[PDB]
Design a protein around this ligand. Sequence first.
Ligand SMILES: COc1cc(C(=O)[O-])ccc1O
Ligand SMILES: COc1cc(C(=O)[O-])ccc1O
Ligand SMILES: COc1cc(C(=O)[O-])ccc1O
Ligand SMILES: COc1cc(C(=O)[O-])ccc1O
Ligand SMILES: COc1cc(C(=O)[O-])ccc1O
Ligand SMILES: [Mn+2]
Ligand SMILES: [Mn+2]
Ligand SMILES: [Mn+2]
Lengths: 335, 335
Amino acid sequence: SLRLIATEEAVTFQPVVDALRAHSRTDDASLDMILVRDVYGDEPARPAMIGRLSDVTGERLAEMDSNGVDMHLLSLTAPGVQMFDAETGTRLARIANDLMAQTVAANPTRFAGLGTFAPQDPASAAREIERVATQLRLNGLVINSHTNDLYYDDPFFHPVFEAIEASGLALYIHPRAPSKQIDRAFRDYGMNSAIWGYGIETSTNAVRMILSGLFDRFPRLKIVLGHMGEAIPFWLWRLDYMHGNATTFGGAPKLKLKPSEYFRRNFAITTSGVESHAALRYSIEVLGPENVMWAIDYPYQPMAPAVQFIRTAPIPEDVKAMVAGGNAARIFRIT
Amino acid sequence: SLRLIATEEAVTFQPVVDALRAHSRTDDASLDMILVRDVYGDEPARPAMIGRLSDVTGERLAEMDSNGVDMHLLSLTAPGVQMFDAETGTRLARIANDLMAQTVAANPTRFAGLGTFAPQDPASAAREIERVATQLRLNGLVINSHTNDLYYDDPFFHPVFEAIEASGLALYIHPRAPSKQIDRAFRDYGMNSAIWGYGIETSTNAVRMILSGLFDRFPRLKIVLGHMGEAIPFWLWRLDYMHGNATTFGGAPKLKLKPSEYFRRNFAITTSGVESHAALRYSIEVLGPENVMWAIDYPYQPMAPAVQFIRTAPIPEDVKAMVAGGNAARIFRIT
Ligand SMILES: COc1cc(C(=O)[O-])ccc1O
Ligand SMILES: COc1cc(C(=O)[O-])ccc1O
Ligand SMILES: COc1cc(C(=O)[O-])ccc1O
Ligand SMILES: COc1cc(C(=O)[O-])ccc1O
Ligand SMILES: COc1cc(C(=O)[O-])ccc1O
Ligand SMILES: [Mn+2]
Ligand SMILES: [Mn+2]
Ligand SMILES: [Mn+2]
């Protein structure tokens, strides 16, 4: 019946797990070290997670079958390879992308894959992006918000976005913990994570990208944001209203379009972790039905409630088909 | 015949203006110094603003009359008295509150008022809050997000919230620029201000308040957030979903209610700066029509579009009356 393609479905591979185990013992002050110790560290607070992330053919497929989920679009879980030094990140990105391709090929009717990269080295990341698109023929790209506590308005990353735009692959900008620029306010009450910091970190990255004019430089970029667009869809009117003040008094560059127009033209969103019919309806209304995709955020969230959320959405069947899988099949080139 | 009570309407008074002019010359590193120099500085980029903020019975009333706006609920404009040292802030809050009460008393069918205080000195602020409630008989309170780069989960401010709860006055937590904990990411593209920083700063403050259990300690507090609730209404499902992880792994304290239940019980929102029928409809649906109030954000925004936004809202007339003014009359003690 309804074709369900879940678009934010995390996976990991042993070489990355091993590298993160080692990294967990270092003095890295990144706020992601909370997650990294909890999942990849010695005496981990979340001991089952590595196994669940690594598994593709056991529990994961069983749960897909029990819930009638056609596909997972897999992505190397945050923080990807971004916490490592440039050489290590670059090496592990290739390894992880090869393993992603192999994972997809073992069950291509049930899995599609996003490749990743190490923007610590923008030139090498650009080469890897090209390899992912043309040599591995993967479905798209994923990166986890900031790299080296810089956001994607920084011209340092222009070679990355040039390659992404040229490749035609959509880039899913997944969260990671608040960067060092903002992490002081996220050290309490678990706010480092999905409950708050993930959304603030990722949305602020994207807003900087828009306001910096990144999408005039690279107008064919396609960006995807989970968690109902990291709430950016809610802020569209205010982003537009206040833009004049930003360019007049704040040194913001003049843009060809309004901020919300970049959001509708260059972005699409997914419903990961936001199983709200009201928020889904709002997003369809302001973005258009072509710009909203379904996701689970497995294994960090369970499949059944995410599935039931979309199966029961109070929207027409044709729009429901678009959200459940049609838009994803287009954006991520899935047949 | 629709009674329009605008709830986020900024004003200033000469003693505060004079103090901010002097403050503008100092080496303060607060991100609010951008606003303060633009408006109160010796060489202001926004030279008309002091006059427009100071004006109550001239341009402001003429514009209210031409647009059929019954009332402004006035508040001392951000950053209030919060940038000053404790003794200066305390004295100026007292003076500004006397001037607010006198302004209101001059035209009490057209103006209501929120008193303010200097949380730099919680014990003195507590006395002033009581005076605002019982002697000046003002309509509520206003404070501008952080004080001293601390948020309102900090036990330092417990005496303030104890007094606010006991007074029965609602506290409008208006924005100011991102605190030093987060300001590094808001130095570009005018993001210090309303376009992005204001919402991130204010929403993060409120989320810390909720997650810290402040509303179990003071369950009768009423908090009001502008800008369509600083987007917290959009995040309710995820805040609730992830709360288990926060209390299990993140050291968040155990709470009597769910995060969204505090938001609906203890908060109400206004539409200042978010003239979106879609966002208004979403907020009414998830918060209830009793929890949404209309505002303009004058003089930072013009009255006519804000008025026309609510007059044309695609909601029933009774709900429209609640949003336009009925809820404000209840929450802010207006006859
Ligand atoms: C590391 O990536 C994630 C982590 C969590 C979490 O920690 O609950 C949730 C969703 C995510 O995709
Ligand atoms: C009419 O202009 C806009 C409308 C909205 C909306 O209501 O969703 C958002 C941004 C805008 O610039
Ligand atoms: C200082 O308070 C505000 C400033 C602005 C601004 O700078 O455009 C807008 C709304 C506010 O209430
Ligand atoms: C002369 O010192 C102060 C005066 C006042 C006042 O006048 O309300 C308030 C606080 C002070 O520290
Ligand atoms: C059913 O539980 C919830 C629903 C919503 C919603 O859909 O607005 C938000 C928070 C919740 O916990
Ligand atoms: Mn995820
Ligand atoms: Mn009164
Ligand atoms: Mn305001």
